[PDB]
Amino acid sequence: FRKMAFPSGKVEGCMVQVTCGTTTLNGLWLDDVVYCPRHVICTSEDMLNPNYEDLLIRKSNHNFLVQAGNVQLRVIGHSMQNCVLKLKVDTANPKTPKYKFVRIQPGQTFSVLACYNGSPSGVYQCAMRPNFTIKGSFLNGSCGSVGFNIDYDCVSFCYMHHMELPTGVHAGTDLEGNFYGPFVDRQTAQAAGTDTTITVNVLAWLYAAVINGDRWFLNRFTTTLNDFNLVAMKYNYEPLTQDHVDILGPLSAQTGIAVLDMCASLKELLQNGMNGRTILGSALLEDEFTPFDVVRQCS
Amino acid sequence: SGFRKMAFPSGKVEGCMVQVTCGTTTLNGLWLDDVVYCPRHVICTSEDMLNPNYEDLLIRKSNHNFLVQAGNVQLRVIGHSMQNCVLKLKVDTANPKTPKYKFVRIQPGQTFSVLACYNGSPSGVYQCAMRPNFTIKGSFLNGSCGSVGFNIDYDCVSFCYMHHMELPTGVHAGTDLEGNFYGPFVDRQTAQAAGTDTTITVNVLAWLYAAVINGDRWFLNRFTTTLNDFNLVAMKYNYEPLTQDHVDILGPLSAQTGIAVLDMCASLKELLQNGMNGRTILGSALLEDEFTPFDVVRQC
Numbered sequence: 001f002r003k004m005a006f007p008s009g010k011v012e013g014c015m016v017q018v019t020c021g022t023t024t025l026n027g028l029w030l031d032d033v034v035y036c037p038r039h040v041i042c043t044s045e046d047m048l049n050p051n052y053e054d055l056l057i058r059k060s061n062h063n064f065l066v067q068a069g070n071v072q073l074r075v076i077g078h079s080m081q082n083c084v085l086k087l088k089v090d091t092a093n094p095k096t097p098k099y100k101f102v103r104i105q106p107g108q109t110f111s112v113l114a115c116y117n118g119s120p121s122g123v124y125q126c127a128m129r130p131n132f133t134i135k136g137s138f139l140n141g142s143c144g145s146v147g148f149n150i151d152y153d154c155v156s157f158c159y160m161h162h163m164e165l166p167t168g169v170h171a172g173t174d175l176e177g178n179f180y181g182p183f184v185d186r187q188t189a190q191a192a193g194t195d196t197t198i199t200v201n202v203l204a205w206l207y208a209a210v211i212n213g214d215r216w217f218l219n220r221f222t223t224t225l226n227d228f229n230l231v232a233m234k235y236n237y238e239p240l241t242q243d244h245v246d247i248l249g250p251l252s253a254q255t256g257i258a259v260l261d262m263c264a265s266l267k268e269l270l271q272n273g274m275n276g277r278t279i280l281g282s283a284l285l286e287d288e289f290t291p292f293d294v295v296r297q298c299s
Numbered sequence: 300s301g302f303r304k305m306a307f308p309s310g311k312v313e314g315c316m317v318q319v320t321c322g323t324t325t326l327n328g329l330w331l332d333d334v335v336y337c338p339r340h341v342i343c344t345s346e347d348m349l350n351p352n353y354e355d356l357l358i359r360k361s362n363h364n365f366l367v368q369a370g371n372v373q374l375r376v377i378g379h380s381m382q383n384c385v386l387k388l389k390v391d392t393a394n395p396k397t398p399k400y401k402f403v404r405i406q407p408g409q410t411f412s413v414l415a416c417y418n419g420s421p422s423g424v425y426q427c428a429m430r431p432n433f434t435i436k437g438s439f440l441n442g443s444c445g446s447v448g449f450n451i452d453y454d455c456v457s458f459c460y461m462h463h464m465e466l467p468t469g470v471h472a473g474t475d476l477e478g479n480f481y482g483p484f485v486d487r488q489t490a491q492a493a494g495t496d497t498t499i500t501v502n503v504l505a506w507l508y509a510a511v512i513n514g515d516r517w518f519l520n521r522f523t524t525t526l527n528d529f530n531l532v533a534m535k536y537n538y539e540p541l542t543q544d545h546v547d548i549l550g551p552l553s554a555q556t557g558i559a560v561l562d563m564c565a566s567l568k569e570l571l572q573n574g575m576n577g578r579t580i581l582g583s584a585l586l587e588d589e590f591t592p593f594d595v596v597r598q599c
């Protein structure tokens with residue numbers, strides 16, 4: 001059981017390099033539009049209090065340099081959708097796959113194609129943290145890197161990297177420029193919220209361990225929802241909901257372990273601990289596997 | 300604050316994966332130029348697997364017994380040859396999406412990306428390291444045989460691994476693209492026991508050097524040890540012995556920082572005897588050993 005990322009081939013052919021003045025970052029080329037963060041029109045000293053509306057008036061089409069490998073594209077017009085700059089080019093991308101723009105919720109997983117200057121360099125699987133950030137490795141030059149899921153033939157684009165927070169974590173928008181969490185695209189002191197553990201993902205991971213055969217944590221006891229939340233809130237675990245129980249329903253059925261029975265095992269691991277044991281070869285409780293991920297990778 | 304283990308982008312490998320069917324057995328193949336490489340146990344049934352006479356089985360097959368599909372395009376097999384534990388199927392059509400490629404044989408401790416495929420279709424990609432017992436603990440289900448491992452340097456894909464067998468320990472075993480197994484394993488349904496898995500000491504040391512470069516320094520101590528003394532303690536914790544070659548490879552890292560290698564070795568021993576004490580190193584609660592020194596020296 002390892003974190004598998006989606007194959008990136010469909011998204012690799014959509015990455016381009018966008019240059020405005022001295023700023024160079026990554027863009028997404030779909031049909032005849034290049035999507036990129038709007039702070040590409042800003043200098044490093046404009047980022048204090050940027051008035052993006054005035055800044056876009058004073059640019060023109062020739063100020064943007066779109067670089068598709070070695071072929072240049074002519075920006076034939078430009079527009080702005082809340083935090084994302086949409087550059088209309090003269091050439092349609094022949095590699096455009098079946099795609100959709102979606103907005104995911106906290107706790108959901110996706111793959112990220114880390115790119116630098118329009119060149120893909122790595123891919124990894126990650127989850128939306130409950131504080132609206134993501135744990136990534138975007139050292140420097142990876143703004144405009146995108147996150148995605150693949151459904152049969154459809155690539156669902158759900159994330160675009162915009163900023164790197166000083167904690168180590170990173171913040172970004174969806175493809176419509178709506179930006180996850182209480183962040184703005186300004187250089188100012190922005191603090192990420194209080195990061196909690198995705199409880200429903202932990203339970204799905206515990207079900208995965210039972211499927212593989214690691215069953216030492218199973219007990220005879222069962223708890224209630226209301227009792228479990230007090231224990232979970234104390235240990236900074238997201239309150240489990242009834243919908244969470246229904247989502248874990250299919251896993252609860254084959255394992256034979258009810259969600260509230262498995263919750264009683266989780267309570268023991270929270271309070272007493274592993275007691276010098278390992279689950280799936282880990283002394284730590286993993287929370288970046290959604291129930292759907294466990295079903296995809298196991299059944 | 301954090302190394303996250305990235306895999307290489309898989310696009311160039313995705314266009315080379317095909318489906319090979321012989322009888323009732325279906326597995327994955329690699330299509331390069333005009334050859335499809337795949338494990339030779341595709342010509343076996345479940346009965347043959349305990350004691351297979353591969354040359355008896357292959358001598359009885361014809362070209363039309365091999366069905367190769369690249370998506371919906373049927374590939375027409377015009378010849379076949381066996382190189383060690385791999386079958387080379389010659390087809391009439393060259394793969395139009397063949398990248399610039401190389402075949403390399405890796406050593407234990409080296410890392411690569413694996414493209415997990417199921418009956419001709421890519422499913423997922425992950426990064427792993429060749430363990431010192433010549434196995435990989437990846438995520439392989441039934442029907443992933445023929446999935447390959449690779450590294451990308453500029454535009455050259457280095458194919459280094461092909462999945463062949465799953466061991467009862469839960470780990471996986473395979474060959475290089477020339478058909479030579481990694482480790483003392485055979486393509487036979489017998490009691491094949493993997494060796495003891497040990498931590499890759501040189502990889503942990505390179506990762507610790509990355510930590511001091513970023514700013515994690517709380518684990519440093521004011522002692523130094525000899526290589527012989529360090530290895531004596533290391534084997535007690537199931538760590539691989541450190542050689543003089545490992546010390547030279549870490550040399551640039553010790554030059555970039557101020558800490559000598561044997562100085563770093565004394566800190567590692569202290570971590571082993573005390574544990575983590577609840578703190579983290581590059582946002583990790585465990586000593587991590589799947590980062591090669593070459594990667595650290597690059598992505599500083």
